[PDB]
Amino acid sequence: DDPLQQTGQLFGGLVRDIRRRYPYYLSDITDAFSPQVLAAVIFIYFAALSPAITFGGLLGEKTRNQMGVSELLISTAVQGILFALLGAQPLLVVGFSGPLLVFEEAFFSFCETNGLEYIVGRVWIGFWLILLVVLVVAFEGSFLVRFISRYTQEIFSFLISLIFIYETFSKLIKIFQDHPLQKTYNYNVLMVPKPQGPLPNTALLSLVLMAGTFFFAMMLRKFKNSSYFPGKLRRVIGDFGVPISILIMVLVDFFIQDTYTQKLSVPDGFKVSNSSARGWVIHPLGLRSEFPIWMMFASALPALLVFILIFLESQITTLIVSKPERKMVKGSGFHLDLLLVVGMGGVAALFGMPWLSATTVRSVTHANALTVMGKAQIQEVKEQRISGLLVAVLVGLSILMEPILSRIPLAVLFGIFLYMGVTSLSGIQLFDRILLLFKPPKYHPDVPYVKRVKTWRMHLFTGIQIICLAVLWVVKSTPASLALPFVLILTVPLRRVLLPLIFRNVELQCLDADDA
């Protein structure tokens, strides 16, 4: 009944993952029949689409359109469908992540200097990824995930929420920089790719649209837990809170005629970003020049970095989502999900498309959206495969449905990202204890780590975790940002060898507890 356990047989953990979950397959279809599930699809679609559009454009720039938006929309769609149908935890949301973009910029630059075909180079990384994951899953290497405690989990989940919130505000500020509040503006600026010079009212409306969307989202959640209107109506308006918030502020922008705001932009059709550079299928041996044999072997080194990047964020995401506290009964599979994510990623390379990963903020948003609230306590979660399938299909079709998307401002979606980031800081005990730094000890809750631990020692423990977050944020800022996963790893030694010198066993049990 314990997922993270070494059996002895090859592919032991994987067979136990399939046998565990696939019996519930029909339930994974019939549980989706609920308007809450539909409200979840609409929400998580916009969560899933905007990153693909944003990161896809950054790949286009950094890579000379050898990979761009089209490639990432297709990858996100196809890998999204396959994972929704075959995966052990369907509530995970596979997609491109900041760390993966950083690597792609890094590997491109290497190939420019050394005179390699970048897109052909990725194919060999992809072959090594397939070889690595089939070895790991064979010898049941996912069992090591059991040594990642709450301590490391909450440092990770908290950092990822802060970064998410930080980047959203960075995007708002960019608008102000591009379109500053001036006395006079040139009034013949071209709009062909984008506004050439600054224009009036764009930055302040963007702020209003953002602040508007966030407010309605937060208010309709407050309303959901209120005692106004009949419960059946109040629950439904609460479920569709985010889609209502979006629809309101999208109509606000629609009626405001003469003021410019940035809209979502998908590619024209389904075709590679640079048609001259590459086709659909990338040749291993080379496109123009012969691919060198040393790099076919040397690609093993980048493959290990990409593996670790995908593994850590994906397996920790799974831990966070599949916690006992959140009422998920169907069962998670670490062995099966690893194989699909990394396996599909290795194959994607061969069609010049990005390998993806189970991303934390989106996956957690998706899981929270399907959670029903009793009395406030968690009653159950709507664990099904339809939400994840429909979002993957919609992201794929997004190119066809440009007429709808071309009327949605980004500023509106920034409000929904602010909502997602804030809402994600919920069951994290780190955040709870950080708040108790500011409350006096009289008005502290009756949770075990308050009663059984002295207030200053509890605070010392919180402070040490805050110092970890600081060190992680500094490494983030420096050029060596691909090290972040390997610095998270060091949080496991800290907890296991260092902290027991300072804190006694009884304190470390209550503070860093498995089930709470």
Add this chain to the structure above:
Amino acid sequence: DDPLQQTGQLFGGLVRDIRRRYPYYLSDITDAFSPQVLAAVIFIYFAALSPAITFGGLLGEKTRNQMGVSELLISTAVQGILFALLGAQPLLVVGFSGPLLVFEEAFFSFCETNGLEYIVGRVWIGFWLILLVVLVVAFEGSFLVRFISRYTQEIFSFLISLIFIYETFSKLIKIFQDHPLQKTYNYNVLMVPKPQGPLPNTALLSLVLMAGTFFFAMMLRKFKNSSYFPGKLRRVIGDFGVPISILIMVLVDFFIQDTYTQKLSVPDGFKVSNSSARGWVIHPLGLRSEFPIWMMFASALPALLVFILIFLESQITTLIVSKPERKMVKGSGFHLDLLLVVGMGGVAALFGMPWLSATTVRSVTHANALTVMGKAQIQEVKEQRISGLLVAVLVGLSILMEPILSRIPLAVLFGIFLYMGVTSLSGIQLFDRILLLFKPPKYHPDVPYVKRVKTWRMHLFTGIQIICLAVLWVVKSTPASLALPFVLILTVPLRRVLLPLIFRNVELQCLDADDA
């Protein structure tokens, strides 16, 4: 011990008002020693100044500067000081009101058509006002205030809060109309009296400044009642919540350089608005032409309307403020306050300055600001004469302190007015029952009118009051807006003769109760 009681002796009620309150005079000075009282001064100053600036300008326009801002600042100041020192209820805030402006426009128009000296005409209204109030106070006519029940009080207090909120939003919308969000503007526009044409970023920044100020104000009140920080620090930051909210958003505007926003504007010095038309002292018999004898007698008719206008709003304001629910022990005086307000107003006329009135939203704001919260229940009120004195003095000096005021945006103060309007809808039982229309009857409070009255009959009673508010709002909208006081009066018949046909005695006791 009952204020509203007929003794038999001439000036009986007045002597009992003075004997009651003036024993507490030293306490009315030493109770002001508290930072809460200082935070109240700063708040109520801006509440008191902006109306005087706004209404003063409208008088300037409507009256050809025979009365303007200077006259109303001086009147508000002098009458404010005298009332703070001599009055029976010092928490009342005397000033100009919308109804009074309407009358002044009306009386001016009459004098233009009939060929009378408007400013000389007011002097005779003022003489009649002095004669009326000395008769009323002699024969103890303020005793009739006891027949104004909760029913009429809450219809009045609710209407006045709605109008207040409506007018604030009307001012924001005017900014958008003056400075619309267009694609191209003209930049050679002049700013000598005010912006001639529309300007970019002005309307959306005004909205942000307003929405900003309101948010901080509401959040710092939430914080006051929270369990964060040490209580002594949390209480102080809660007390100075509004002055902090103002200071924040005033600094936001300060650093934003090139964008235009409207600022507070006081007159240059202490001098009459139109020096040619009038001097400081107005001659009864006439300035240029001889004032006619028929109008010296006919002025009795306008005097009755002005009396009723001032009496009703001032005496109902006193009822609302001096309720048992609000812990005010010092004691209110209806006979003394009436004499001062209307007496001072009659004399003001002789110096060509406006008669004023105890205004509801400001007085209620002032009283709430001085209320301390135990545990949430009302512990006590800081009843003193210093708050009201300092605000009256500051309004007088406002002309001298133009350098400070010229950096305060109005948009910021609109946020504080929104806060005042919302906060004023608090202890009104009408508002409470209007909210229960939307709650299901399971989640209704254990107040007597819920237990002892059937839910639909309670709702029928609420609905009849909503129909009164509607009828009052329609009369407001029509040209005959000076009738509003006389339509409020009819709410007393409704309660006393009509409602007891529909509702039984037991229901009317619980619904419309004196102490609750």
